[PDB]
Amino acid sequence: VLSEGEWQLVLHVWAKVEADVAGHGQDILIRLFKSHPETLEKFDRFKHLKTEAEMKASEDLKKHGVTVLTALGAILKKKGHHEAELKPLAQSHATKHKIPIKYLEFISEAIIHVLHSRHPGDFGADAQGAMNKALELFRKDIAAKYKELGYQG
Numbered sequence: 001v002l003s004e005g006e007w008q009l010v011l012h013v014w015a016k017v018e019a020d021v022a023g024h025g026q027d028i029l030i031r032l033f034k035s036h037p038e039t040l041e042k043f044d045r046f047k048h049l050k051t052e053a054e055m056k057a058s059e060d061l062k063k064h065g066v067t068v069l070t071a072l073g074a075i076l077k078k079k080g081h082h083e084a085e086l087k088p089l090a091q092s093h094a095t096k097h098k099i100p101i102k103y104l105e106f107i108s109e110a111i112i113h114v115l116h117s118r119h120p121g122d123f124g125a126d127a128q129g130a131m132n133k134a135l136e137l138f139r140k141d142i143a144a145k146y147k148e149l150g151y152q153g
């Protein structure tokens with residue numbers, strides 16, 4: 001359970017991300033695909049991309065980064081009361097997209113890295129710890145839905 005002070009740190013940096021949702025979404029997906037190439041293989045939509053320059057040039061990838069970050073921002077702004085938002089996301093990611101929880105840990109690392117690069121003054125260690133707690137809570141709740149459905153592993 002995050003404290004109110006922890007949530008304020010999370011949402012303070014997130015309000016900065018929202019100034020350039022698409023730039024952040026590109027940086028995060030590119031970091032994820034470069035750091036963990038098994039993740040790119042889950043996207044029939046993107047698996048033709050073979051270089052970072054091709055990734056940066058793809059408008060469709062930039063569009064999907066906005067989709068992703070808009071869904072994450074709506075979950076963070078619920079401050080833990082996010083059951084309605086996680087149901088469809090866990091369902092699609094477990095049963096249609098076939099995304100292991102571990103890959104959610106990988107995109108969490110990529111989000112934290114990109115927030116640290118772009119917002120260092122609002123992403124000191126206190127805010128890094130709070131964002132890690134928020135993303136851990138996200139993963140915990142999704143993993144419980146995966147387990148229900150027979151996909152936790």
Ligand code: HEM
Nearest residue numbers: 039042043045067068071072088089092097099103104107
């Ligand atoms: C912060 C974590 C994530 C969020 C908020 C998120 C959100 C979304 C949303 C909103 C969609 C479109 C609606 C839907 O299908 O449910 C989507 C699609 C998808 N996501 Fe995620 N996602 C996350 C992580 C991941 C990861 C880590 C992977 C793969 C390693 C992944 C793979 C996919 C795939 C394959 C699609 C379908 C893309 C397409 O062909 O249109 N997602 N995601």
